[PDB]
Design an enzyme around this catalytic site. Structure first.
Site, PDB file in Angstrom:
ATOM      1  N   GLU A  55       0.458  11.898 -23.281  1.00 40.45           N
ATOM      2  CA  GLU A  55      -0.517  12.524 -22.394  1.00 40.45           C
ATOM      3  C   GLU A  55      -1.912  12.340 -22.989  1.00 40.45           C
ATOM      4  O   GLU A  55      -2.869  12.060 -22.266  1.00 40.45           O
ATOM      5  CB  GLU A  55      -0.205  14.010 -22.216  1.00 40.45           C
ATOM      6  CG  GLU A  55      -1.109  14.713 -21.210  1.00 40.45           C
ATOM      7  CD  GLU A  55      -0.631  16.109 -20.875  1.00 40.45           C
ATOM      8  OE1 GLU A  55       0.555  16.253 -20.512  1.00 40.45           O
ATOM      9  OE2 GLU A  55      -1.436  17.064 -20.963  1.00 40.45           O
ATOM     10  N   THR A 100       4.931  25.269 -10.884  1.00 35.74           N
ATOM     11  CA  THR A 100       4.368  26.328 -10.044  1.00 35.74           C
ATOM     12  C   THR A 100       3.003  26.006  -9.440  1.00 35.74           C
ATOM     13  O   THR A 100       1.968  26.468  -9.927  1.00 35.74           O
ATOM     14  CB  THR A 100       4.256  27.645 -10.839  1.00 35.74           C
ATOM     15  OG1 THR A 100       3.456  27.431 -12.009  1.00 35.74           O
ATOM     16  CG2 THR A 100       5.634  28.130 -11.261  1.00 35.74           C
ATOM     17  N   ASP A 159      22.563  27.120 -22.820  1.00 33.66           N
ATOM     18  CA  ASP A 159      21.678  25.970 -22.987  1.00 33.66           C
ATOM     19  C   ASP A 159      22.104  25.098 -24.172  1.00 33.66           C
ATOM     20  O   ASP A 159      21.274  24.659 -24.967  1.00 33.66           O
ATOM     21  CB  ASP A 159      20.246  26.494 -23.162  1.00 33.66           C
ATOM     22  CG  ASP A 159      19.203  25.395 -23.202  1.00 33.66           C
ATOM     23  OD1 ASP A 159      19.367  24.369 -22.510  1.00 33.66           O
ATOM     24  OD2 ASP A 159      18.196  25.579 -23.917  1.00 33.66           O
ATOM     25  N   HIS A 211      16.563  23.982 -25.455  1.00 34.83           N
ATOM     26  CA  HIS A 211      15.229  24.054 -24.861  1.00 34.83           C
ATOM     27  C   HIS A 211      14.496  25.307 -25.312  1.00 34.83           C
ATOM     28  O   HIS A 211      13.337  25.522 -24.961  1.00 34.83           O
ATOM     29  CB  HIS A 211      15.296  24.046 -23.332  1.00 34.83           C
ATOM     30  CG  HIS A 211      15.862  22.786 -22.759  1.00 34.83           C
ATOM     31  ND1 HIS A 211      17.206  22.624 -22.495  1.00 34.83           N
ATOM     32  CD2 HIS A 211      15.269  21.617 -22.422  1.00 34.83           C
ATOM     33  CE1 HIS A 211      17.414  21.410 -22.020  1.00 34.83           C
ATOM     34  NE2 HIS A 211      16.256  20.778 -21.966  1.00 34.83           N
ATOM     35  N   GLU A 227      15.099  17.753 -28.313  1.00 36.57           N
ATOM     36  CA  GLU A 227      14.164  18.285 -27.325  1.00 36.57           C
ATOM     37  C   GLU A 227      12.717  18.292 -27.807  1.00 36.57           C
ATOM     38  O   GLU A 227      11.807  17.889 -27.074  1.00 36.57           O
ATOM     39  CB  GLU A 227      14.569  19.705 -26.927  1.00 36.57           C
ATOM     40  CG  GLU A 227      15.439  19.746 -25.700  1.00 36.57           C
ATOM     41  CD  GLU A 227      14.776  19.031 -24.542  1.00 36.57           C
ATOM     42  OE1 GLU A 227      13.720  19.502 -24.071  1.00 36.57           O
ATOM     43  OE2 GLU A 227      15.307  17.994 -24.118  1.00 36.57           O
ATOM     44  N   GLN A 230       0.883  -1.164   0.000  1.00 36.65           N
ATOM     45  CA  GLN A 230       0.000   0.000   0.000  1.00 36.65           C
ATOM     46  C   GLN A 230       0.922   1.215   0.000  1.00 36.65           C
ATOM     47  O   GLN A 230       1.779   1.347   0.876  1.00 36.65           O
ATOM     48  CB  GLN A 230      -0.887   0.005   1.247  1.00 36.65           C
ATOM     49  CG  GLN A 230      -1.905  -1.122   1.277  1.00 36.65           C
ATOM     50  CD  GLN A 230      -2.894  -0.976   2.415  1.00 36.65           C
ATOM     51  OE1 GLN A 230      -2.538  -1.104   3.587  1.00 36.65           O
ATOM     52  NE2 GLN A 230      -4.147  -0.698   2.074  1.00 36.65           N
ATOM     53  N   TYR A 281      23.166  16.401 -28.536  1.00 46.14           N
ATOM     54  CA  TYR A 281      22.501  17.401 -27.701  1.00 46.14           C
ATOM     55  C   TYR A 281      23.115  18.794 -27.758  1.00 46.14           C
ATOM     56  O   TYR A 281      23.521  19.352 -26.733  1.00 46.14           O
ATOM     57  CB  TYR A 281      22.469  16.918 -26.252  1.00 46.14           C
ATOM     58  CG  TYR A 281      21.260  17.395 -25.486  1.00 46.14           C
ATOM     59  CD1 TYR A 281      19.972  17.088 -25.927  1.00 46.14           C
ATOM     60  CD2 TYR A 281      21.398  18.132 -24.309  1.00 46.14           C
ATOM     61  CE1 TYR A 281      18.849  17.498 -25.214  1.00 46.14           C
ATOM     62  CE2 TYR A 281      20.279  18.548 -23.585  1.00 46.14           C
ATOM     63  CZ  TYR A 281      19.009  18.225 -24.044  1.00 46.14           C
ATOM     64  OH  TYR A 281      17.901  18.612 -23.330  1.00 46.14           O
ATOM     65  N   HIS A 316       8.523  12.530 -21.714  1.00 41.55           N
ATOM     66  CA  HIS A 316       9.564  13.357 -22.324  1.00 41.55           C
ATOM     67  C   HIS A 316      10.914  12.698 -22.051  1.00 41.55           C
ATOM     68  O   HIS A 316      11.741  12.556 -22.949  1.00 41.55           O
ATOM     69  CB  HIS A 316       9.537  14.773 -21.719  1.00 41.55           C
ATOM     70  CG  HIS A 316      10.659  15.662 -22.172  1.00 41.55           C
ATOM     71  ND1 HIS A 316      10.466  16.736 -23.015  1.00 41.55           N
ATOM     72  CD2 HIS A 316      11.981  15.655 -21.871  1.00 41.55           C
ATOM     73  CE1 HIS A 316      11.618  17.354 -23.211  1.00 41.55           C
ATOM     74  NE2 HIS A 316      12.553  16.718 -22.527  1.00 41.55           N
ATOM     75  N   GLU A 317      11.126  12.277 -20.809  1.00 39.81           N
ATOM     76  CA  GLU A 317      12.394  11.655 -20.445  1.00 39.81           C
ATOM     77  C   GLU A 317      12.619  10.291 -21.090  1.00 39.81           C
ATOM     78  O   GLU A 317      13.723  10.006 -21.558  1.00 39.81           O
ATOM     79  CB  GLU A 317      12.511  11.527 -18.926  1.00 39.81           C
ATOM     80  CG  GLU A 317      12.483  12.852 -18.158  1.00 39.81           C
ATOM     81  CD  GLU A 317      13.497  13.868 -18.667  1.00 39.81           C
ATOM     82  OE1 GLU A 317      14.516  13.464 -19.260  1.00 39.81           O
ATOM     83  OE2 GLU A 317      13.282  15.082 -18.457  1.00 39.81           O
ATOM     84  N   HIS A 325      13.785  10.514 -24.586  1.00 40.02           N
ATOM     85  CA  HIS A 325      15.190  10.849 -24.811  1.00 40.02           C
ATOM     86  C   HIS A 325      15.937   9.533 -25.007  1.00 40.02           C
ATOM     87  O   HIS A 325      16.855   9.451 -25.816  1.00 40.02           O
ATOM     88  CB  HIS A 325      15.796  11.602 -23.620  1.00 40.02           C
ATOM     89  CG  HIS A 325      15.611  13.088 -23.681  1.00 40.02           C
ATOM     90  ND1 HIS A 325      15.967  13.836 -24.784  1.00 40.02           N
ATOM     91  CD2 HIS A 325      15.140  13.967 -22.765  1.00 40.02           C
ATOM     92  CE1 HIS A 325      15.725  15.113 -24.544  1.00 40.02           C
ATOM     93  NE2 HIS A 325      15.224  15.219 -23.326  1.00 40.02           N
ATOM     94  N   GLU A 367       0.504  21.783 -23.760  1.00 37.77           N
ATOM     95  CA  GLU A 367       1.396  22.506 -22.862  1.00 37.77           C
ATOM     96  C   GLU A 367       2.336  21.475 -22.254  1.00 37.77           C
ATOM     97  O   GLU A 367       2.009  20.289 -22.212  1.00 37.77           O
ATOM     98  CB  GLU A 367       0.601  23.190 -21.753  1.00 37.77           C
ATOM     99  CG  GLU A 367      -0.402  24.212 -22.259  1.00 37.77           C
ATOM    100  CD  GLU A 367       0.265  25.363 -22.981  1.00 37.77           C
ATOM    101  OE1 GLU A 367       1.051  26.094 -22.340  1.00 37.77           O
ATOM    102  OE2 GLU A 367       0.009  25.534 -24.188  1.00 37.77           O
ATOM    103  N   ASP A 420      -0.593  27.987 -15.972  1.00 34.57           N
ATOM    104  CA  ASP A 420       0.681  28.145 -16.659  1.00 34.57           C
ATOM    105  C   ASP A 420       1.376  26.809 -16.897  1.00 34.57           C
ATOM    106  O   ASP A 420       0.857  25.751 -16.539  1.00 34.57           O
ATOM    107  CB  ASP A 420       1.597  29.084 -15.867  1.00 34.57           C
ATOM    108  CG  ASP A 420       2.027  28.502 -14.535  1.00 34.57           C
ATOM    109  OD1 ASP A 420       1.338  27.596 -14.025  1.00 34.57           O
ATOM    110  OD2 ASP A 420       3.050  28.969 -13.993  1.00 34.57           O
ATOM    111  N   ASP A 426      -3.407  18.315 -23.198  1.00 39.99           N
ATOM    112  CA  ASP A 426      -3.244  19.656 -23.737  1.00 39.99           C
ATOM    113  C   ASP A 426      -1.942  19.690 -24.528  1.00 39.99           C
ATOM    114  O   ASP A 426      -1.243  18.677 -24.625  1.00 39.99           O
ATOM    115  CB  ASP A 426      -3.185  20.674 -22.600  1.00 39.99           C
ATOM    116  CG  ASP A 426      -2.222  20.259 -21.505  1.00 39.99           C
ATOM    117  OD1 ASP A 426      -1.030  20.024 -21.810  1.00 39.99           O
ATOM    118  OD2 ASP A 426      -2.659  20.165 -20.341  1.00 39.99           O
TER     119      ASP A 426
END
Ligand SMILES: [Ca+2]
Ligand SMILES: [Ca+2]
Ligand SMILES: [Ca+2]
Ligand SMILES: [Ca+2]
Ligand SMILES: [Zn+2]
Length: 316
Positions: free
Chosen positions: A177, A194, A226, A231, A166, A61, A157, A142-143, A146, A187, A200, A185
């Site tokens: 998703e 946040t 970067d 990115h 990316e 559990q 990269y 996403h990971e 890669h 996004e 956002d 979505d």
């Protein structure tokens, strides 16, 4: 470890209850034997040593706050594996059912997640910028993507090849998703970004400019930060992908959308058959056009839409 396959129950980062595949041998471990050579989730115990210890639980559990990130990393790795197998007929990231390993509780207040060449790693976030990163299905997908890219195209990269790397991860992170139908979505990272601000996200594929990222080749970042803006410039490709799927008029160029399924088929073929380690944006366009041609014909609406989308973002 060797044991008996069973099913446990727990709560994820967002407080949702879900069933997870575990293995019993004295303790119940986060080891899913139902997918390929297995999905293993480890506890990094706030350290940076990897992978840490295979997650062990006494009663099968997982409702403790400390368990949440593990529950989601384990579960979403499974959903992503299912997506690649059921939609693209690909067995794990290497195409040969390689075991998928993830470590959670990496470091302290770590606002990042990554693929280190051998496994996935998730920080818990600082509670302000991010909450545990494995709570986002687009983050997990996403990971893992890669890893898929590393075993196929092998896009370096850096600079444009890195931006494509990316974008591919954002594209498939988003398609997964939608596959899971979890408040889908266009996004990126909205579920774990946040917690004190609603509406956002870290990046937007529908409108990259909303967060300052370029949505046209003329606005590409040419600096050294970067790794050459991997990115940042990914926004140009993300916008192209969004247009191919949903359609729209961008900078005066109209694109007829062909849907998410076809977008996925076109980009997966480009990734696995035509892209190379040093491919740039122009070569990605060529690869996408060729892929759409292979699948739907040179005079198809699909090919037309791919060309229009890249024209819209200024990639020739
Ligand atoms: Ca327990
Ligand atoms: Ca969402
Ligand atoms: Ca999302
Ligand atoms: Ca937020
Ligand atoms: Zn990435």
């Amino acid at each position: 470890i060797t044991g008996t396959s069973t099913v446990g129950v727990g709560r994820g980062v967002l407080g949702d209850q879900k069933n997870i595949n575990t293995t019993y041998s004295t303790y119940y471990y986060l080891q899913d034997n139902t997918r390929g050579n297995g999905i293993f989730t480890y506890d990094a115990k706030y350290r940076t040593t990897l992978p840490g210890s295979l997650w062990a639980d006494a009663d099968n559990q997982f409702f403790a706050s400390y368990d949440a990130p593990a529950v989601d990393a384990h579960y979403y790795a499974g959903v992503t594996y299912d997506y690649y197998k059921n939609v693209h007929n690909r067995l794990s990231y290497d195409g040969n059912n390689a075991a998928i390993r993830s470590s959670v509780h990496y470091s302290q207040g770590y606002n990042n997640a990554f693929w280190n060449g051998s496994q996935m790693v998730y920080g818990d976030g600082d509670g302000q910028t991010f909450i545990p990163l494995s709570g986002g299905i687009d983050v997990v997908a996403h990971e893992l993507t890669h890893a898929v890219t590393d075993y196929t195209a092998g896009l370096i990269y850096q600079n444009e090849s890195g931006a494509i790397n990316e974008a591919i991860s954002d594209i498939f992170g988003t398609l997964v998703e939608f596959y899971a139908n979890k408040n889908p979505d266009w996004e990126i990272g909205e579920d774990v970004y946040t917690p004190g601000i609603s509406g956002d996200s870290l990046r937007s594929m529908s409108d990259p400019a909303k967060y300052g990222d370029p949505d046209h080749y003329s606005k590409r970042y040419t600096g050294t930060q970067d790794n050459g803006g991997v990115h940042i410039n990914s926004g140009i490709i993300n916008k192209a992908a969004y247009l191919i799927s949903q359609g729209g008029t961008h900078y005066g160029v109209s694109v007829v959308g062909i849907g998410r399924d076809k977008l996925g088929k076109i980009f997966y073929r480009a990734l696995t058959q035509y892209l190379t380690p040093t491919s740039n944006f122009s070569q990605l366009r060529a690869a996408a056009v060729q892929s759409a041609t292979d699948l739907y014909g040179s005079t198809s609406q699909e090919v037309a839409s791919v060309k229009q989308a890249f024209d819209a973002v200024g990639v020739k």
